[PDB]
Design a protein around this motif. Sequence first.
Motif, PDB file in Angstrom:
ATOM      1  N   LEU A 182      19.030  39.934  23.416  1.00  0.00           N
ATOM      2  CA  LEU A 182      18.875  40.622  22.139  1.00  0.00           C
ATOM      3  C   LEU A 182      18.802  39.635  20.981  1.00  0.00           C
ATOM      4  O   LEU A 182      17.955  39.768  20.091  1.00  0.00           O
ATOM      5  CB  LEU A 182      20.025  41.601  21.917  1.00  0.00           C
ATOM      6  N   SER A 183      19.679  38.636  20.977  1.00  0.00           N
ATOM      7  CA  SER A 183      19.831  37.747  19.835  1.00  0.00           C
ATOM      8  C   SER A 183      18.874  36.567  19.858  1.00  0.00           C
ATOM      9  O   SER A 183      18.924  35.729  18.952  1.00  0.00           O
ATOM     10  CB  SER A 183      21.271  37.232  19.766  1.00  0.00           C
ATOM     11  N   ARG A 184      18.007  36.473  20.864  1.00  0.00           N
ATOM     12  CA  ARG A 184      17.128  35.326  21.010  1.00  0.00           C
ATOM     13  C   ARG A 184      15.647  35.669  20.990  1.00  0.00           C
ATOM     14  O   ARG A 184      14.834  34.782  20.717  1.00  0.00           O
ATOM     15  CB  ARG A 184      17.445  34.591  22.324  1.00  0.00           C
ATOM     16  N   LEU A 185      15.270  36.921  21.237  1.00  0.00           N
ATOM     17  CA  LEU A 185      13.914  37.207  21.673  1.00  0.00           C
ATOM     18  C   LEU A 185      13.371  38.459  20.995  1.00  0.00           C
ATOM     19  O   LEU A 185      14.124  39.335  20.565  1.00  0.00           O
ATOM     20  CB  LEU A 185      13.904  37.313  23.204  1.00  0.00           C
ATOM     21  N   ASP A 186      12.044  38.520  20.904  1.00  0.00           N
ATOM     22  CA  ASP A 186      11.360  39.579  20.173  1.00  0.00           C
ATOM     23  C   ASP A 186      11.409  40.882  20.974  1.00  0.00           C
ATOM     24  O   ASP A 186      11.160  40.871  22.184  1.00  0.00           O
ATOM     25  CB  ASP A 186       9.907  39.156  19.935  1.00  0.00           C
TER      26      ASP A 186
END
Lengths: 49, 49
Positions: free
Chosen positions: A43-47
């Motif tokens: 969730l916090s890294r990727l589109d």
Amino acid sequence: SSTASALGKLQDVVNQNAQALNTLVKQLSSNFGAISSVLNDILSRLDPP
Amino acid sequence: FASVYAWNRKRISNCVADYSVLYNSASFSTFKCYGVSPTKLNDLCFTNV
């Protein structure tokens, strides 16, 4: 009192249940073909798309 | 810039990187990332870039 190895069936049932729970909770640490085994990083890294 | 068979290599670490000023600039023809959405780049900390 002396021979500890007397109650086998109950211990077997308890062990089976504990092992089932252990493998169920251990299965949470697998990629399953994804890029990571933790959802928060995804969730916090990727589109989203 | 060196040749393709002698590609220039550099290691950077121990710093603060602002990718927004890299993202907003239109001087780059292609700006394509794979494992990370560019707009989230400023929200992560790495090592050994």
